[PDB]
Design a protein around this ligand. Structure first.
Ligand SMILES: c1ccc2[nH]ccc2c1
Ligand code: NA
Ligand code: NA
Ligand code: NA
Length: 163
């Protein structure tokens, strides 16, 4: 297990444009295309991202390429964020994957709402953090995925992603 296998479980893999849990056009392994309701706007984003006229379909290789870019960009965003970097750097590698998972799903702007959780994680109060993390729109809207990410922060193991 690692961040790539973890997000591949959580996000799936679809080679045609679909709508994510929030209703937004998406492709591949959870690559958000746009928040616009325009399918044409999404297809345009996809063509820009892949570098060819795709007609709304990509290959597995192309999906994995976008995914690798997306994970990298997520982590580099964390390391440029004065609020997030110190918490990330405080964590072990397993918990760092859980942090990237959150940013991948909700963005830095979503994670901005979790200041009190992030403090508890920096303090290594794992059970308290887990409770605070679940008091969220995130948990209520995607509970099974949030439970897996939260278990990862709580335990510092991959137990939620085995089987
Ligand atoms: C950096 C980014 C996202 C995060 N979620 C929990 C801790 C943490 C640190
Ligand atoms: Na992808
Ligand atoms: Na992706
Ligand atoms: Na886990």
């Amino acid at each position: 297990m690692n961040i790539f296998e973890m997000l591949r479980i959580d996000e799936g893999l679809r080679l045609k444009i679909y709508k994510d849990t929030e209703g937004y056009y998406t492709i591949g392994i959870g690559h958000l295309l746009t928040k616009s309701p325009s399918l044409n706007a999404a297809k345009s984003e996809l063509d820009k991202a892949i570098g060819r006229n795709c007609n709304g379909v990509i290959t597995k290789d192309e999906a994995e390429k976008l995914f690798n870019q997306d994970v990298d960009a997520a982590v580099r965003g964390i390391l440029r964020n004065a609020k997030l970097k110190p918490v990330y750097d405080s964590l072990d590698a397993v918990r760092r994957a859980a942090a990237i998972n959150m940013v991948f799903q909700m963005g830095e702007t979503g994670v901005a709402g979790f200041t009190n959780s992030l403090r508890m994680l920096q303090q290594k109060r794992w059970d308290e953090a887990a409770v605070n993390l679940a008091k969220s729109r995130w948990y209520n809207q995607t509970p099974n995925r949030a439970k897996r990410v939260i278990t990862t922060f709580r335990t510092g193991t991959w137990d939620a992603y085995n089987n």
